[model samples]
Target: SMEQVAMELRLTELTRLLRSVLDQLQDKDPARIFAQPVSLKEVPDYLDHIKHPMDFATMRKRLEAQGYKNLHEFEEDFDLIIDNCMKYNARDTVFYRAAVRLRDQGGVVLRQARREVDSIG
Candidate 1:
């Protein structure tokens, strides 16, 4: 029971950190282009190239559903968005450049969260 209680508290802390990271990502995306799924109609070959698709709306929904077991899982999906973009888009494209930028900025958020989690543990 004691361990269960401790885990619950830890889960809450991690959830807070996850929300913070997602919120930052949302703010960073002012254009709201990555806010939802890329329309298959618009980008017909997107699914052909990207096996695993990720976006802000999906991540937010997954977080609400408690689909992630830990911070690492959340980070995995977060990184996937950037990975998918860079994989599908050309280097000179805006999507590729935006994803690269997101990776750099988002890395800071994840590193800070890891430090806090480690310090707590």
Candidate 2:
């Protein structure tokens, strides 16, 4: 019971950090495409290429259902979103550029969260 309090506090901080990062990412994408999953109907054979399909909406649900245990997990999923984008689209395309920007800006946010969480017990 005594340790539970600290555990809950840590969970709260991590959850808040994750939620905040996701919110920022959603806002960063001007097209708002990253907010939801890629549609197979729209992009036929998309699944054939992308092995791990990740989106903000899916991450949101995953976070809500089972919050991340560490920042590393969150970073990996974030990277997957961008990596999938770059993989699917050509470098000159807006989609690819957007992913590049997200990766750049998102990196900054993640680093900040890392520092913020480092001090937390």
Candidate 3:
């Protein structure tokens, strides 16, 4: 009734926002996120959602010891854990996906916040 090309227009914007998030992280040889970085001190705090306290502390430890400057570096350690899960076990496909979802909860939250804010009313 309202000249409702609503769905079509939304599809256009939805494509852009999702594309933007992916594009920003695409050629990340630079070790960055947020597509915006002000200083080094503020970067580490972004990793606070890590599942275990000791694992989280270990990441922080590596950051300082290894001079890692961003979440991507911190995630290198986590990447190993995920990669091992996939490689060492072939029967836990369902549980593997569950683990991925659990690991991704933080991304899900961040994605929701950023995705909605960047789209239209």
Candidate 4:
């Protein structure tokens, strides 16, 4: 019983310790998500600039240029978008559109992610 508790506590610490470190990193410079800024630049005339499917460097850089700093501002925008959608009977909203896109693209990814975490009941 004590060994089980020890394993649980050790696992929790291992996962959550980095989260606290990263959160404090944000406190130092909330504008910059990562410690080193990787120039999200185009490689050449022969390939795609973004490596990830859902890369958002352009939008983020645009917003950063427009003086929209930090997660608080972005989250304020998210709240407004989702709240407006909630007001309008949950149709034709950003949340719905994005979720639908994700569903159409990788429904299993979203579903299995929650199913593993017991997030969706």
Candidate 5:
């Protein structure tokens, strides 16, 4: 299961994956980098279908193909991602605050996101 896979992942693996993606972006021109815009248009529909961690793999692949090889690179940036997800998934201020706090302090970005979900009711 995706939850099990996410639970079993070590901080080291997640960090390594993120770093690998960032490294790929180091040489690209900044103009081209920002050329592609990510709209929130599909966010609701997307969230509806994401039942597990691995479900994100397809999005990861799409990003990778677009030269975002390190889509997972910014473990720090995922704070916003997890925060929004918690807001959407739990719809409770307590859970949202807890997730935000974890995202701010957790060492690994993915770990924080996973923990946010686990901490929810």
Candidate 6:
């Protein structure tokens, strides 16, 4: 239940952020819209490769074994991997539509996370 609640909160925050981005973008460039409806089929496979919270010491040792000397060398690549996971996996059609509505109307029909949670049940 905690995970579910955390997930709900995360989704809520992400939706808000995406909607805000969409709103700002809509006026400038409607043609290159990012508010496309997302489906499960669009999820990227890099999600399966992440190992949560890896220890710096262990990672350093592994990197040393593989001949890397510094965290900076690997940092950008690791950041890209994490960023891609967040971008691709958290997709929803309803969220996209809600974002588009918020962009066009300046607000959403369902304005709160609790409302969405209740509606799903």
**Candidate 6 on 30-70: residue-level lDDT in tens?**
44322232223553443364434222333334443443322
TM-score against truth, every candidate: 0.89, 0.91, 0.32, 0.26, 0.27, 0.26
List runs of model 2 lying over 4 Å from the truth.
none
Model 6 CA lDDT for position 105: 45
Model 5 CA deviation exceeding 4 Å by range = 1-55, 69-77, 89-106, 109-121
Model 6 CA deviation exceeding 4 Å by range: 30-121
Candidate 5 per-residue lDDT, tens place, 62-116, comes to 4344422232444434434454557455656654555555444444544544454
Lowest summed lDDT across 10 adjacent residues in model 2 is found at: 112-121
Winner by TM-score: 2
Tens digits of per-residue lDDT, candidate 1, 50-102, equal 88888999999987775677888998998889898988889999989999888
Best by lDDT: 2
Scored by Cα lDDT, where does model 1 land? 0.85
lDDT of each: 0.85, 0.87, 0.42, 0.37, 0.42, 0.38
Clashes of each: 0, 0, 0, 0, 1, 0
Candidate 4 weakest ten by summed lDDT:
46-55
Winner on TM-score between 5 and 6 is 5
- The lDDT of model 3 is 0.42
Evaluate model 4: give its lDDT: 0.37
Cα-lDDT of candidate 6: 0.38
Q: Is candidate 2 or candidate 3 better by lDDT?
A: 2
Clashing pairs in 1: none
Angstrom error of the Cα, residue 79, model 5: value is 3.2
Better of 2 and 4 by lDDT: 2
